[PDB]
Every structure is written in structure tokens, then in C-alpha cells.
Amino acid sequence: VIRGDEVRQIAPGQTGKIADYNYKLPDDFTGCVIAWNSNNLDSKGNYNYLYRLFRKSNLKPFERDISTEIYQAGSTPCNGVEGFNCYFPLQSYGF
Amino acid sequence: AYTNSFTRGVYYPDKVFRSSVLHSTQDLFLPFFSNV
Amino acid sequence: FKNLREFVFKNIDGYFKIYSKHTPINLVRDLPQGFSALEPLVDLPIGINITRFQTAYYVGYLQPRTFLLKYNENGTITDAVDCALDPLSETKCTLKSFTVEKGIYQTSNFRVQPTESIVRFPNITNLCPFGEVFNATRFASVYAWNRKRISNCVADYSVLYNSASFSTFKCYGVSPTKLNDLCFTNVYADSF
Amino acid sequence: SYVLTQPPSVAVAPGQTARIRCGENDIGSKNVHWYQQKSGQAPVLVVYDDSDRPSGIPERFSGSNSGNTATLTISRVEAGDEADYYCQVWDSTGDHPDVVFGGGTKLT
Amino acid sequence: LTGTGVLTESNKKFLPFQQFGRDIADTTDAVRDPQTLEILDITPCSFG
Amino acid sequence: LTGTGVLTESNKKFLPFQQFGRDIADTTDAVRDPQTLEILDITPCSFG
Amino acid sequence: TPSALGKLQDVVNQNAQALNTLVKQLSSNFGAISSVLNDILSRLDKPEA
């Protein structure tokens, strides 16, 4: 589930937000990507759907983990609802 | 604990039926005449 | 001890491969002369990041090598040659046959492997002025085009390409792949 | 309509740092230059670009251009710095090309 | 695939794992099927 | 710039517009540090 | 005079002219944008790149 401005990471193909951090394809990927404009199906404001903000490194293809994995710049691991120099991984988005 | 190992983990280089050929496949394989 | 069991798992691109073979053993602690030719059956997905595993059993460490084989008419592995073991087997790998005649054989050459990556960045934190130049209210006419020199940027070029507002982005003398990792001397911006 | 605005005066102790700025709206999209005029003689340029300096004038004088400011920094202030300074942002100015000068800073 | 050649059964060494394959010079060299359990290498149609 | 090499202090006197260099094979053979204004040359590592 | 040894001087100049010429075909673009290969070897995804 992606927006309309972010079709261009999977056509023709580069790294990005949606590419590295949300649904990753291989760097030498030769298979078929599946995509269609389906505005009437997600829309019903649909604020239930989620996304990932940012990560320390660019991820490998087909990764899904429901884990509390925080982005941070320092080496010290932060925990809680808010962390020092810490951005939250899982956030909702609206359509 | 060290043990000398001869020719462990050698595998066919493809899924292809291989016969009567000298196949020069550079491939990720375990080395020979080592210790495990 | 009677049984020796092993499997090979290789993790590339999120895949999780399974190779299967069983082998009887008559030795307690040492390893026998013979081989173990495994055969794959099924490949699975995982979806998670795996760096450690925890469990009669054996572990392997994998390094890339070069190998040259020989096959009979029936289709069975007769012998195998590790082309980086000793330079005799490297000569066997170069000459494509397992018999080597008498002489000097010019196999390959070498160069020193690096130890680590050394990056000499300019040690200043700053956002580059492409946020300010592109977001300008006033542009000029085409015969009297504005010119700007931009000197110090440590921030990335990722906002150049990768946006749907930038409809036409033909780069002639450079690829858009090179934009994220480059280092240059001067930046000129012309606007009309 | 673009007109350069400069403060009238600033006073510093010798051997210390001085902060002289010429900053308006969207000046970071344009180039800034700096000049020195002593009282009764011809002006001399001391800063060529947003940060680059010409020859003769040492590393005492430095500057940077970011956002809505362009600030000249004078380090280890001596007696010879007491002069007139002007910023010279070039602009298209509604397709009538102008060399716009600033109001002038007097450093004492 | 497309093969213009004489077709005859073979009795090669096979697995279900080794179902498909090609020659070292990339002609057709490994076919297995549930219809006829023999292997197939396409000898060409006496071309010359 | 990505590359493998060991650099020493260059004895060449360069004017400040000369930052990089183009040799007879058009590769980078001279380079100047951005923090300190020293000059260094580029050769790769040892061969054999 | 170099006129006697000019046969092998032409042989060594033909060889070394071919060698530094072969360095000039190291320099040349042949239609490309650079003599280096670092323009695509960077972190974007490459199904077509």
C-alpha cells in the first residue's frame, strides 16, 4: 500500500523511503512487480494503515518484523515512549 | 580441538545433469586440506 | 557413535535454503577420508534478520573459492580441485585439465587487499543550499539568467531525483546513481 | 523590490571577534560580495564570494551565507580595520539588471 | 524450447531434484516428465 | 572517491584552482585535502 | 647517427607507441561519460540501471 507520488521507486527502480524501508526488492531483481491504481479500495479517511519512518541501514528484500526497533544516531539504546535522539518506527498514515 | 578435514561439502555446481565434462565453475565452496 | 547429519543453509535476499544428506560414521572425534555430497529439496522464506543460530552436529565457515571438476560418462563426481589451495592446483585450474605438462605456466597475478575504508569528509554539519535555491520566489528571464555558486555541502543529493514534482530529469554526463556518492569541486545553479 | 539593509555602527575591543552582517529575504539564493573603503581613498575588495577571500587580506576575515543572513567575521581586531564596509548583492531586479549596494557598516 | 531433431529415449542418471538442464554448449540435455520416464537429449535431424 | 591506494605528501607546488589531476590515462593522480591545504598524490597498492 | 639502429628504434617506438597508445585507449571514453566505472557502482537498485 503506497501513495501516488511514490510509484517511481519501483518504476524503474532505485533506493528510497518506500524501497529500502517499507518493501524491499533485490538490487539485481529480474522478476515482475505488481502494481495498480486502486483509489476506490483503500479509501472509505482510512487512518488504519501504517508505515515505517527511517532506519540506520538500507534493508534487504522481503523483511517484516513486528519489533520495537528504534532509529537512533548514538550507540546507547533508548527505550520508552520517547527517547533521546530517537525516532519512532511505526506510525499510521491517512488516505 | 582441531581436526584435519579432507574434501567436506563438495556439491554439484548446478542442478544440471553433469557428465563427461571438465566444468570450470568458480563458486562458493568449502576449501580443501584445511582444519575444522 | 554411528550417525553424522549435516545441512547447508544459505541466506541471500531473504531466502533460506535447505540441503539434505545423511552419512554413517565409524569415527568418534576425527573426520573420515570420504566426502558428503548434499542435495537440496526445499527453499523457505523467513522475513526476519538472522545473525545467530542456537541448537552429532557440525558447523561450517564459508569463504569464496575457485573449483574445477571432472565427470565420468555415468554422471558421478570423480575428483575435485581447489584452485586456491596450492599453486599446483591453481595450474590445474588454469590449464583446464587435471594433467599438467612440464614447463612454466603463467596463471594469474595479485594485488593487496584493503584493510578498512577511510573517509576524509569535511567536518561540518550543514544542510546544502538546494533547499533554498529551488524554493525561490523570483526567477529571471532566460536571456538574463541568474547564477549562483554553492561551495560547502556535506548533506546528500537525495532530494535531486526521487520526487514527483521533478518531472523531467535527464542527466547527460553523469548517472543519477552517482548523485548519492560523489565528490566534486564546484556547483553552479542557473535558473529561468 | 529588493533593497539591501545594513546596520549603522558596531564597536568592538581590540584582539576580539566582530560580527558584521548583511542579511535580507532570500539572499541565500544570490551571491554576496564585501568591500573595504578607507576614508578618502579608493575602495578595496576583501571578500570575493560567500566565503572565499582574495590575496593580500589574510585569514582574519571570513564569512558564510546561509538562509536570511550573510555575516562577516573579523578575528583579532587591530587598529587598521576602522573603515567602511558594503555588501554588493547582484540581482535581476525585474529584468533591469542592477548592482545593488548596501547602506554601509562603520566598524570602530 | 524449440528443438528440430530426432527424438529417442535415454537412460541417464536422474533425480527429481535434477529435473531440467542444458549441455555445456547449451543444447537440450535434461528432461523428465510423469508421462514417459526416460530422459531426452535432442540429437539434431541429421543436419549438415 | 572510491579507490585503493596509499598516499604520501606530494612535493608539487599547485595553484589553488588546481584541485585534482588528469594523467595520460585520465585517472586521478593528484588530490588536495579539504581541511588542511596539503597536497598528496594517488598511486594504488603494491603489485606482483 | 641513429640511421643504422633506426630499424629497432622504429621497432621499440612502434611497441612503446602502441603501449602509450593503449594507455590513450585507457583514457578514452568510446562514447561513455567517463573513463571510470564508479557512475553506476553506488547504492541505487539496479534492475535496469
Judge: D50–C149 Cβ closer than 8 Å, yes or no: yes
Q: How far apart are the first and last CA of chain E?
A: 22
A7-39 burial, b if ≥16 CB within 10 A, otherwise e? ebbbeebbbbbbbbbbbbbbbebeeeeeeeeee
Q: How far apart are CA C125 and CA A47, in angstroms?
A: 36
Residue D2 Rama label (left phi>0; alpha psi -120 to 50; beta): beta
Q: How far apart are CA F39 and CA F20, in angstroms?
A: 10
Fill in the amino acid letter for A72: Q
C144-158 burial, b if ≥16 CB within 10 A, otherwise e? eebebebebbeeebe
Judge: C41–E17 Cβ closer than 8 Å, yes or no: yes
Give the count of beta carbons closer than 10 Å to the beta carbon of residue C81: 19
Omega before C24 cis (within 30°)?
Answer: no
DSSP code for A40: H
- The structure's method of determination equals cryo-EM
Q: How far apart are CA C6 and CA B36, in angstroms?
A: 14
Residues D68 and D6: beta-carbon distance below 8 Å: no
Fill in the amino acid letter for D48: Y
Q: How far apart are CA E6 and CA A30, in angstroms?
A: 35
Q: Residue C187 pairs with which residues in a beta bridge?
A: C150
Whether chains C and A touch (3+ CB pairs under 8 A) is answered by yes
Neighbours of chain A (3+ CB pairs under 8 A): C, G
How far is B12 from chain C, CA to nearest CA, in Å? Answer: 8
How far is F36 from chain G, CA to nearest CA, in Å? Answer: 26
Alpha helix stretches (DSSP H) within chain E: none
Q: Domains in chain D, please, with CATH? A: 9-108 (2.60.40.10)
DSSP code for A77: P
Decide: helix, strand or coil at residue E43: strand
- CA distances to A48, A94, A95 from A44, rounded to whole Å, are 11, 11, 8
Size of interface A-G (CB pairs under 8 A): 27
Q: Which three cell numbers stand for residue A69?
A: 526497533
Judge: E13–C74 Cβ closer than 8 Å, yes or no: yes
- CA distances to D3, D47, D92, D93 from D98, rounded to whole Å, are 11, 20, 7, 6
Q: What backbone torsions phi and psi does residue G39 show, to the nearest 5 degrees?
A: -75, -35
Q: Which residues of chain G make contact with F2, given a CB cutoff of 8 A?
A: 38, 41
Q: Residue D10 pairs with which residues in a beta bridge?
A: D107
How far is C83 from chain F, CA to nearest CA, in Å? Answer: 18
For testing contact with chain B, the best of E24, E26, E39 (most B CBs within 10 A): E24
* Cα R_g (chain G), whole angstroms: 20
- CA distances to C1, D84, D98, D104, E27 from B7, rounded to whole Å, are 21, 84, 82, 84, 32
